[PDB]
Amino acid sequence: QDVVDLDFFTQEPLHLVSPSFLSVTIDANLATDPRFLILLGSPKLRTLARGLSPAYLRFGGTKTDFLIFDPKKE
């Protein structure tokens, strides 16, 4: 009918994932937004990000290969 029986395998784990299994990105293009410093300062955004700790934050994307570090830039 609409009742489904489940089989479980619990003898030993098939795999171990990282404690950071569910991780997140910020696209490299965001660093071209002139508001970048202000946006990442948002208290709301920090609160939401902390909810996902532990996690990796990967900063990358297509613009990864079109961004240059300028150590003289203000």
Place this chain on the structure above:
Amino acid sequence: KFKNSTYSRSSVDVLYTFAKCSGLDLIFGLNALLRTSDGQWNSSNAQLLLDYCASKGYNIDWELGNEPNSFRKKAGIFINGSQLGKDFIHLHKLLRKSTFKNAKLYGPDVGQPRGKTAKMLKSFLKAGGEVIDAVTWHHYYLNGRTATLEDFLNPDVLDTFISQVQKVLQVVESTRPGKKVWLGETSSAYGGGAPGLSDTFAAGFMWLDKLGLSARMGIEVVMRQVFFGAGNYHLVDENFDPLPDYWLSLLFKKLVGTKVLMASVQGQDRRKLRVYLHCTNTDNPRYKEGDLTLYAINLHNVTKYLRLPYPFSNKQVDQYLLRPHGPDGLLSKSVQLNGQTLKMVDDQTLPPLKPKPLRPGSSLGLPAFSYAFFVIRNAKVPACI
């Protein structure tokens, strides 16, 4: 328009501070398209950045290049896998010479194999696999420009991910057996996501199913494109409002542990009822070693009732059922947990994520087009202890 732009020390600082103050570990992709006249990676710019970050005491992991499989189309230059591997070895040496204590290096962040074979991934791993700490690849199910709600609910679409995973893992097994494999950038639909789709409750089936299958098939880390940004697949929009996939991810983080088990349906498998099983996240103060977290997707257009196998039947179960809130149905940008809309309490306070205790021995009700977590309490599973 020219894609090339610059970024400052202040930009590096705010990104590092954002990661550090949120309890996240930053991975920074370096520019692989700075090349010498001899076809090698020119490390001059990266050296400046490494020196700066090391001077500041920043603990940062590194990547080099993004989707090198498309360099020929995006930049008019072809870098083969052997050469990319040599470039990664050069970067590895720079990291060893730095004052970074155990900086990790990940790569090559290649696009998914598709129908073809990951020839570039294989040559890269032969040449440079010894210096990377995990293999990164990317995946999207669909083109954001043409995806429809039907596609987001389609188990055939969901199943296409299985073959992509198998192809990557086979390449890694044949060149660097037991090297860790990570999804380094992944979401529902490419090209910025599907408008009015990738930011809705309906996006959750692809996201939860991808996590379930990744865990079950040996992917160690899955990096969601994006936490925050302008793309329709963002977890948080630029008004700083969380989308339904944010709350799905928060519940996953709180409930699902590191030990991957297995669950399956006894009957015929139409692939619309999809079930996954881990030990419960031990960091959750509500639960204890031995508890199990079942999570499940129901893509049928009618309610299904799950019966737990003995002895887990007649255990106390905590339900975390997610359903769309409001008149938009599956296309809603708001989501309810056990009938209560999820919203921040204020700008610095996440809401309580309260379980609904079920009557012991009751079958688990999963409405049409919904997904849920079920924590099986006092399961006393030795593999979880």
